């Protein structure tokens, strides 16, 4: 097959029911995820190959960065409930891979207020209930999959991409392999 368990992607031993059909897992603190996002925009690019309004998940893990990693994961939430995702993304992966300028949640907050989210409204979603709910998700969602390294993508609770196991001399050829296999493991 073109396609092989074990090369382009992994099987799950337990599989996942119910999972979101497609999610991704990544850290700020991740230098693949950092690469992921500015150089090679994988999300953009799956969700370019996906069909016409199919949900892509993506979540923020706690692993990595300590105390810091959990305030993050909990900015992701904050980020998440307000819809503001394409906002903060690259300053907060620039704030602390780049300028390493984010050392406290304080900054953290800083790169929403100076990406437009007022104070009182970042610091409400911060606080919320709501937004427990979603941090608790993002937890749930790595635990089911005894999740251990980011970036990581799956496919209906089922399949793990497996990028070690494409060609990366050119970075396009890389990202379309990557979406591809997107595509084909939806289509399984
Ligand atoms: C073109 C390109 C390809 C790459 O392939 C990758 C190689 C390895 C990983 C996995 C990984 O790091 N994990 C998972 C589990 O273990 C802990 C951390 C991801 C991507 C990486 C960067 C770039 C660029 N630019």
């Known amino acids: 097959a073109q396609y092989e368990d074990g090369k382009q992607y992994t099987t799950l031993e337990k ?8 999610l991704e897992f990544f850290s700020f603190f991740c230098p693949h995820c950092y690469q992921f996002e500015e150089v090679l925009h994988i999300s953009d690019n799956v969700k370019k ?3 016409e309004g199919v949900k892509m998940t993506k979540y923020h893990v706690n692993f990595m960065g300590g105390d810091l990693g959990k ?3 909990q900015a992701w939430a ?6 503001v995702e394409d906002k903060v993304t690259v300053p907060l992966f620039e704030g602390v891979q780049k300028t390493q300028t984010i050392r406290s949640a304080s900054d953290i907050r800083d790169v929403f207020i100076n990406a437009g989210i007022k104070g009182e409204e970042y610091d409400a979603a911060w606080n919320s209930f709501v937004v ?18 980011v970036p990581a993508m799956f496919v209906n609770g089922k399949y793990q991409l497996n990028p070690q196991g494409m060609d990366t001399s050119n970075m396009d050829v890389f990202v379309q392999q990557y979406a591809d296999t997107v595509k084909y493991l939806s289509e399984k």
């Open 15 to 22: 599989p996942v029911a119910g999972a979101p059909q497609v």
């Open 49 to 51: 190959k996906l069909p």
């Open 71 to 73: 305030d993050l994961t």
């Open 78 to 83: 904050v980020a998440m409930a307000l819809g």
């Open 132 to 149: 427990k709910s979603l941090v608790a998700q993002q937890e749930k969602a790595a635990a089911d999959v005894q999740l251990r390294g």
